[PDB]
Structure formats: C-alpha cells, structure tokens
Design a protein around this ligand. Structure first.
Ligand SMILES: *[C@@H]1O[C@H](CO)[C@@H](O[C@@H]2O[C@H](CO)[C@@H](O[C@@H]3O[C@H](CO)[C@@H](O)[C@H](O)[C@@H]3O)[C@H](O)[C@H]2NC(C)=O)[C@H](O)[C@H]1NC(C)=O
Ligand SMILES: *[C@@H]1O[C@H](CO)[C@@H](O[C@@H]2O[C@H](CO)[C@@H](O[C@@H]3O[C@H](CO)[C@@H](O)[C@H](O)[C@@H]3O)[C@H](O)[C@H]2NC(C)=O)[C@H](O)[C@H]1NC(C)=O
Ligand SMILES: *[C@@H]1O[C@H](CO)[C@@H](O[C@@H]2O[C@H](CO)[C@@H](O)[C@H](O)[C@H]2NC(C)=O)[C@H](O)[C@H]1NC(C)=O
Ligand SMILES: *[C@@H]1O[C@H](CO)[C@@H](O[C@@H]2O[C@H](CO)[C@@H](O)[C@H](O)[C@H]2NC(C)=O)[C@H](O)[C@H]1NC(C)=O
Ligand SMILES: CC(=O)N[C@@H]1[C@@H](O)[C@H](O)[C@@H](CO)O[C@H]1O
Ligand SMILES: CC(=O)N[C@@H]1[C@@H](O)[C@H](O)[C@@H](CO)O[C@H]1O
Ligand SMILES: CC(=O)N[C@@H]1[C@@H](O)[C@H](O)[C@@H](CO)O[C@H]1O
Ligand SMILES: CC(=O)N[C@@H]1[C@@H](O)[C@H](O)[C@@H](CO)O[C@H]1O
Ligand SMILES: *[C@@H]1O[C@H](CO)[C@@H](O)[C@H](O)[C@H]1NC(C)=O
Lengths: 184, 49, 216, 322
C-alpha cells in the first residue's frame, strides 16, 4: 500500500524507464488511472500495477468418477500462486493444490494438479488458449492442446474422382426451444 | 476446491467441467508512505527553544 | 431405434431445453431472494420498519426498500426481455426449420441436419421442439479415373447428367452421388464443337443406340 | 468484471455495505460468464464445421486456378494466408485496461487454431468440393467442381471447359484485385473495427465511471473512510456503491445487447459457411452479388471474411424470341 503525497493506492512498485518531465509528478494512461509515480525524495520514476489479481477455476470430472480436481489461477505466473491464496488454509487439501510437481503455465494462467502431456486429444474440459484438460490417463487429470481434428490428406489429382458405392440414412436430433414459462 | 465448487453450484454432485469458484488477490505485504524530503533547519524549529 | 436409445440413455441430450427452464427458474429464485435484502435498510420486512420505526423515519426506510426492490425487479425484467428475444429468435429458427424440412425438402446444406436432407419428423417437448432430420450420407467411396469430356467422332462429348468415371479398362458415365456405371451413349451425352479446345479430354467410343435398329 | 473489486476495491467496509444489497454481483458475474461462453460457442459453430483437418496436396495443380492468396503460407511463422495476414494487420488499448478488475484476453481457440480450421475448410472445398460437407470427402478435380457449380447455376458445363483458361485467369485477377482493395482501403474491415472500438469504449467508460462521485464527497473510498467518521462515511459509501452499481448494471445490459447482436451475426456467418462455403446456395444476394458459385472462408480478429465468387453476365445481346 503506497501513499505518495496523498496518492493512496495499492500495487507493486517497480523501476520505470519513462522519462518524466522535471515538473511532472504522476503518470496516467488513457483509462485515467495511475500507471507510474515519481518518488518525492528522489528523481526516480516507478511503475504501478495490480498485485496479482485473478479468478480461480476448478476443473473436475464427474464426482461419481473421481474426487481429485485441478486448480487454474487466471493470468498469473505460477511463482506467485503459493502467495496468491496466502497458503493459510487447512494443511491438507488446498496446500497440495497451491504447489506441486505438476504445475503448468499457459496464456490462460497457472494450472496445478494437471500433468501436461505432448499428446493432443479432443477438448474435454476447455481451459483456454487452445488448451483443455481431460481426466483420462493410475488415472489422473492431464492438460494438453486440443486437436482441431484428425489429419486427412485427400488424395487429390486432376484426373481422378471418388464416387460412393452404398449410402446410409442417418437420423440426427435437433432440439430447439420454442417458448418459456409465461411468468407474470 | 471440490467443496468450493459444490458450494458455488449449491449441490453435492458436480458434473465434468470447469467452474469459476471465486477470486484471489495478493494482499498488501506491507504499508509504505513516502513524502518529500525535509528541508534543512526550517525556521519552525528555530522559533521553538 | 438408435436415436430413441440415445435419447433414453443420454440425460444431457435435452440439456438445451432444460437449461432454458433452469435459467428462468434460477431467475425466479433470485427474484425471491431479492425480497430478503436490506438494501441498506434496518430490516427487509416491511412490518418491522412499520412497527419499530416511527412514520418520520419509517417513510425513508420504506423508500429505500422500495428503491432496492424496484431496481431488482427492473433488472429481472430486463434479463427476462433479453431471454425472451433469444427465445423468439430460436422459435423463428424452429418455425423456418419446420417449414423447410417437415413441409418440404430444403437445399440448404446442414440446415435440415447433417447430410443430404430428405425429410424431418417433428416431436414436441416441454417448451421446445425436436426435429429428427433424416439425411442421405455416402458410406463407402471408390476412386476411379475421370475425364472432363469424350472425343469419339472428333467432337467433345459431355454428360447430360452425371460424370465420366472409368476403372482400369472401361469407361462409363455415372451419377455424382451414386456409383451406377452406364454405357456412354448419345442419349446421356451432348456435343459442343470440336474436341481440341477442352483440356484433359480423352478418346473413347460413344455407342449409338440407333445402330442395332439401323442395321435392321 | 470483478463486481466486488470494481465497486469496492479491497474496501472491507464497502464489501460489508454491498453484502446488504443481495447478490447483484453474482448475477452480473453469471451474465458475463454466459456472454463469454456464448462467444466461445459462436466461434466454435462458425469455425468447427469441418469434421477432419483436410490438407491441400503438395502441388497446386488445379487447372490454372490460383489459391496462394487464400491458402496458408509455410514461409511465414504463422500459417496464415496473404489475405488473412492483411486482414490481421489492418485490424489494430484493451491490454492497458486490466487493472480495475477486467480479464479479457484468454480465448478458447487461438488464432492459430482458427487459421487451421479455415485452411481445412479451404482444402475440403478445393479438393473435395461440397462432398466433404455432407459425409465422406470425395476427391474431384477443381475444374470438374467448377463445371458442377456452373451446371448448378443453370449454365452448361461445356462453357467452363471451352473457357477454362479464361475463367481461371479471371478468378486470379479478381483475387488479386480484392487483395489490393483490402490492402489499400482501411474501411474495408469497418464492421470488426467498429465492434472492437465499441467494446473498448464501453470498457473505458466503465473504468472512468469510478471517478464520478455520484453525489458523494469524493470518488475514492479511502478519502471518505479517513476524512469522514463511520456514521457519515457509511452513507457516503452507500451512495458511491449505488452509483457504481448503476453504472455496472448499465454496462452489463449494453454488453448483453451487444452479445445478442454478435450471436445473431455469428449465426448468419455459420449459415453462410454451411451454405456458401460447404455447398452451393440458390439464395439470391445471400452469398454475394450474382449467381453464387463458391466461397472462401478467411479468419480475421474476432470475425470471418467470405470471398463470395459469383458468375455475373457481362455482355448482353438482344434477339427476337417467341
Ligand atoms: C453397402 O452398405 C450397406 C450398409 O450396411 C450394406 O448393408 C449391410 O451389409 C451387411 C454386409 O453384407 C449386412 O450384414 C449381413 O446381415 C445378415 C443378416 O443379419 C447376416 O446374415 C450376414 O452375415 C451379414 O452380417 C447387413 O445386413 C446390410 N444391411 C445393414 C442395414 O447393415 C451393404 O451390404 C453394402 N454393400 C452394398 C452393395 O450395398
Ligand atoms: C483423341 O483422338 C484423336 C483422333 O480421334 C487424336 O488425334 C490424333 O492424334 C494422333 C496422334 O499424334 C495424330 O497423329 C499424328 O499427329 C502428329 C502430331 O500432331 C501429326 O504431325 C501427324 O500428321 C499425325 O496427324 C492425329 O493427326 C490426330 N488427329 C486425328 C487422328 O484426326 C487425339 O490425340 C486423341 N486424344 C489423345 C489425348 O490422345
Ligand atoms: C532529499 O533529501 C535527502 C536527504 O538525505 C537526499 O538524500 C541524498 O541521497 C543521495 C543519494 O542519492 C546522497 O548522495 C546524499 O548525500 C543525500 N543527502 C543527504 C543530505 O544526506 C535526497 O537526495 C533529496 N532528494 C531530492 C530530490 O532533493
Ligand atoms: C493432369 O496432370 C497430369 C500430370 O501432370 C498431366 O499429365 C501431363 O499431360 C501433358 C499434356 O500433354 C503431357 O505433356 C505430360 O507429359 C503429362 N505428364 C505426366 C506426368 O503424365 C495432365 O496433362 C493434366 N491434365 C489433365 C489430366 O487433364
Ligand atoms: C458424468 C458421468 O456420467 N459420470 C458417470 C459415468 O462416468 C458412468 O459411466 C455412469 C454409470 O456408469 O455414471 C455417471
Ligand atoms: C511428459 C512430456 O512429454 N514432457 C515433454 C518434455 O519432456 C519436453 O521437454 C517438452 C518439450 O520439449 O514437451 C513435454
Ligand atoms: C485409382 C486406383 O486404381 N487405385 C487408387 C490409387 O491410385 C491411389 O493411389 C490409392 C490411394 O488412395 O487408392 C487406390
Ligand atoms: C503455381 C503458381 O503459378 N503460383 C503463383 C505464382 O507463380 C505467382 O508469382 C503468385 C503471385 O500472386 O501467385 C501464385
Ligand atoms: C511472470 O509471468 C510471466 C508471463 O506470465 C513469465 O514470463 C515470468 O517468468 C513470470 N515471473 C515470475 C517471477 O513468476
């Protein structure tokens, strides 16, 4: 919590390369929010940013199938995750999910409890940034990059065609809402 | 976290998927107050004593 | 039978319609919960304010409670209006699907289900409709050699309706969506100019159906 | 939007005061999550219409037709076509707004995956035509595909084979002309740029609304907490909370309306892809102006571009008829 000549705020101070004018004291962005500050005791400029901030998401398969779950912290490098939740919860359970061997970093954020693998499968539980987690393997939660599909190189040529021999009469169910309860 | 998900869903069973349970923020580690350095021997102290 | 079994076994098949219902239900529940909110007032029960507090301050307390409840109700009504617009769009889509699929055959791709649409069977459901889109779909495909046209009598020939396919030795004309090879004849082909302008044209004989009759 | 943080900002007293208002923040968060899921579903529906990731042949022997401008370029780091690269470059604040409780960036599908989906759709349309859009993909020469489309629009296939070279040259010239028009004209992508600008303006207005006192002594909770004692700081914070909550409700309602509009646009785009891209559409002026033949999908930041190809009469001669 920083106070600079009444400029009360909270954030992480860091060295700034901005060249403030001699008379200039505070910095601002297009949003009209402080982004830099000058130390009143020395001609130094320091940036201001939110501490870590972020939502927490639980990725879990069907409870009747398994109990272990993965924890995703949004847009935060894993190094800050142990301090992100203060690690002051009950000694088992949450403490395990705050740090461990299976820790992965992605544009979405930091994932814990999911073992990253090179193999790509269909997106089971979407996470983001083209990354999804699946419970399939002992069975454990894994995270991977969802595969858009199976590669199929069509044998194209300028003098060859493909004609069906038999067919299939498929039936597909399409469900569409038509109305809602007439609440008054 | 499973119990937090159950709370947010208000149910004892949770289906496969990802659920946003809550938010988190790194609390202020310490409080820092900085004001301009103090001028040398202002007349205020001269007046007293 | 397979779709019936899938619907019976799969609980999430109707997840769409149920979700809608659930959404509405949830909203209703939320509205009721909004009646148990102080909104800065001393209490959330009008009787408590009326009894404990005298009219001079009970007036402002009830005004605050009324403002909070009215804001909650307006938010709920706006959400309901947005959801009703979404439901109207869905119902218009469903009516269009009923008209173009059940009452007729639609040439739109992936509109009346996946595949070459044939017909659809409407079914009712709580606040929703289900379409059993029936679609012809190719199952097994065989690859052959094809040419854009045929030059039999020094003139290019093009299929009247179909494509010229050919296995190892012989040449045949078959419909695009089914492998039904037929003998190439002038009946199912038409000529257009010479055969030195088309690229990829091949030599072949177009049997004349009149030749057996001409001989007699 | 972190409703509690945006309204209060690590103010315990403000959080306690807002707790008396019910769960408005809960509904706002639910609506925003639903909007995000809606956007993800729209993107999936528009771009996940191909069962398999079809790949073009190593040699582009398409009877003179050129698809380099629309096909992926291996040389570039990102496997994006020239037109796709131009669209991405032309479209260009948000990253400098994630300070007051905004998390925007993470999409379900990255630009690379959307580019791969578009490439697969293009490969299926070129090598297989519309066959891959209704079952197993059946290979066919592109010249024969154009012949089939000409027959479909009511023109005998013989014209294409008689003027295959001319038609291919015209198609290449049209592709080059549209590429040049997109490069030179900055208003070609007006819709996507306008949507992005509207979203950025809405977010900026929401952020700036925190500086409005809404009838309070000050717009910063610390000043009210310090200068004013709790008996009056409570009412001041309540007034500020009411103002901020009203602003957030208005912003969320506008976001919901815009999300509904975007869902309608995405449904239209998916219909066009199903009909214009995965098949031949008989609808007039639906897949471009003129007798539609085929379409080429291209990805752009938060949008799609269809290069609708249309046969159009050019020279008309008058004759007597009975
Ligand atoms: C083209 O594809 C269709 C689609 O399946 C084929 O029809 C099916 O062909 C199989 C193989 O001959 C049939 O299985 C047979 O069933 C009988 C009676 O149960 C059984 O005694 C045989 O031992 C064999 O298992 C199947 O009944 C038949 N129909 C269906 C609905 O699957 C068709 O044969 C393929 N070929 C052609 C030229 O159409
Ligand atoms: C399809 O059939 C036609 C004839 O029915 C083929 O055209 C003929 O091709 C032969 C092969 O060369 C020609 O013979 C010789 O060609 C040389 C070079 O052009 C020329 O200098 C000779 O005087 C001699 O003509 C023949 O002239 C030509 N035309 C005929 C027979 O009327 C055609 O080649 C066949 N298509 C394909 C793809 O082979
Ligand atoms: C404000 O006053 C302080 C008083 O200490 C100054 O501190 C100086 O710091 C530098 C190092 O950067 C030392 O070399 C000097 O010896 C310090 N001065 C004294 C008197 O000890 C500080 O520089 C001043 N800042 C401004 C902007 O005037
Ligand atoms: C389709 O592609 C094949 C393979 O390249 C082409 O075959 C060539 O045809 C020309 C035409 O005179 C010959 O000069 C070449 O020697 C052929 N090359 C080979 C490797 O066979 C064919 O012309 C193309 N066009 C079609 C099939 O219509
Ligand atoms: C999400 C879900 O359906 N979970 C389980 C499923 O894995 C299991 O197959 C079924 C009965 O076997 O009970 C349920
Ligand atoms: C479990 C597993 O497959 N881990 C691999 C890791 O060994 C490799 O270094 C990385 C890319 O280099 O991809 C991942
Ligand atoms: C056309 C024919 O007779 N046989 C084909 C062959 O040419 C092709 O290379 C192979 C790959 O699918 O399939 C078979
Ligand atoms: C195989 C082929 O002709 N590819 C062409 C290339 O020659 C041309 O330089 C380029 C310019 O648009 O377009 C593509
Ligand atoms: C912080 O996050 C960035 C990217 O999110 C990463 O490159 C960097 O290494 C992280 N630093 C720490 C100390 O976690």
């Amino acid at each position: 919590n920083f106070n600079f000549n009444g400029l009360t705020g909270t954030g992480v101070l860091t060295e700034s390369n901005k060249k403030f004018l001699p008379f200039q004291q505070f910095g601002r962005d297009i949003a009209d929010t402080t982004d830099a500050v000058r130390d009143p005791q020395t001609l130094e400029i320091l940036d201001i940013t939110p501490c870590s901030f972020g939502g927490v998401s639980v990725i879990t398969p069907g409870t009747n199938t398994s109990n272990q779950v993965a924890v995703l912290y949004q847009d935060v490098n894993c190094t800050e995750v142990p301090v992100a939740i203060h690690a002051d919860q009950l000694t088992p359970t949450w403490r395990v999910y705050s740090t461990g061997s299976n820790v992965f970093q992605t544009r979405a954020g930091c994932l814990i409890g999911a073992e990253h693998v090179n193999n790509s499968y269909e997106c089971d539980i979407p996470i983001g940034a083209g990354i999804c987690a699946s419970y399939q393997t002992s069975q454990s939660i894994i995270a991977y990059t969802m595969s858009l599909g199976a590669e199929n190189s069509v044998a194209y040529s300028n003098n060859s065609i493909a004609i069906p021999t038999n067919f299939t009469i498929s039936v597909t169910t399409e469900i569409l809402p038509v109305s809602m309860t007439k609440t008054s | 976290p499973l119990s937090e998900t159950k709370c947010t869903l208000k149910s004892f069973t949770v289906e496969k998927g990802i659920y946003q349970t809550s938010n988190f923020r790194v609390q202020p580690t310490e409080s820092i107050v900085r004001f301009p350095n103090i001028t040398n021997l202002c007349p205020f102290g001269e007046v007293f004593n | 039978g397979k779709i019936q079994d899938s619907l019976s076994s799969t609980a999430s098949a109707l997840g769409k319609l149920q979700d809608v219902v659930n959404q509405n239900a949830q909203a209703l529940n939320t509205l009721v919960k909004q009646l148990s909110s102080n909104f800065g007032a001393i209490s959330s029960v009008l009787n408590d304010i009326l009894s404990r507090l005298d009219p001079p301050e009970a007036e402002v307390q009830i005004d605050r409670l009324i403002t909070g409840r009215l804001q909650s109700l307006q938010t709920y009504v706006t959400q309901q209006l947005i959801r009703a617009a979404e439901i109207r769009a869905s119902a218009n889509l469903a009516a269009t699907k009923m008209s173009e699929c059940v009452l007729g055959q639609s040439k739109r791709v992936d509109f009346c289900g996946k595949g070459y649409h044939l017909m659809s069977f409407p079914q009712s459901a709580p606040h929703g409709v289900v379409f059993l889109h029936v679609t012809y779909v190719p199952a097994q495909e065989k690859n052959f050699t094809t040419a854009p046209a045929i030059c039999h009598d020094g003139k290019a020939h093009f299929p009247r309706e179909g494509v010229f396919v050919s296995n190892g030795t012989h040449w045949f004309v078959t419909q695009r969506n089914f492998y039904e090879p037929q003998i190439i004849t002038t009946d199912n082909t038409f000529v257009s100019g010479n055969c030195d302008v088309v690229i990829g044209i091949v030599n072949n004989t177009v049997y004349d159906p009149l030749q057996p009759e001409l001989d007699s | 939007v972190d409703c509690t943080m945006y309204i209060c900002g690590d103010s315990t007293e403000c959080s306690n005061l807002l707790l008396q208002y019910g769960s408005f923040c809960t509904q706002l968060n639910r609506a925003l999550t639903g909007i995000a899921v809606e956007q993800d579903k729209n993107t999936q529906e528009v771009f996940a219409q191909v069962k398999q990731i079809y790949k073009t042949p190593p040699i582009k022997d398409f009877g003179g037709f050129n698809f380099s401008q629309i096909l992926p370029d291996p040389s570039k780091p990102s496997k994006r076509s020239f037109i796709e690269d131009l669209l991405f470059n032309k479209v260009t604040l948000i990253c400098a707004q994630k300070f007051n409780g905004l998390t925007v960036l993470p999409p379900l599908l990255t630009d690379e995956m959307i580019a791969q989906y578009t490439s697969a759709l293009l490969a299926g349309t070129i090598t297989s035509g519309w066959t891959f859009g209704a079952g197993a993909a059946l290979q066919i020469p592109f010249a024969m595909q154009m012949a089939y489309r000409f027959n479909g629009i009511g023109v005998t296939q013989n014209v294409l084979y008689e003027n295959q070279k001319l038609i291919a040259n015209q198609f290449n010239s049209a592709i080059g002309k549209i590429q040049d028009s997109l490069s030179s004209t900055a208003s070609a992508l007006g819709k996507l740029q306008d949507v992005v600008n509207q979203n950025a303006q809405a977010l900026n207005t929401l952020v700036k609304q925190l500086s409005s006192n809404f009838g309070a002594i000050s717009s910063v909770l610390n000043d009210i907490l310090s200068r004013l004692d709790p008996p009056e700081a409570e009412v001041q914070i309540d007034r500020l909370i009411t103002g901020r909550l009203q602003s957030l409700q208005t912003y969320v309602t506008q976001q919901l309306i815009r999300a509904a509009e975007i869902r309608a646009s995405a449904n239209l785009a998916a219909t066009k892809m199903s009909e214009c891209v995965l098949g031949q559409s008989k609808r007039v002026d639906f897949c471009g102006k003129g007798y539609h033949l085929m379409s080429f999908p291209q990805s752009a930041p938060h949008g799609v571009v269809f290069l609708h190809v249309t046969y159009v009469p050019a020279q008309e001669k008058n004759f007597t008829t009975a």
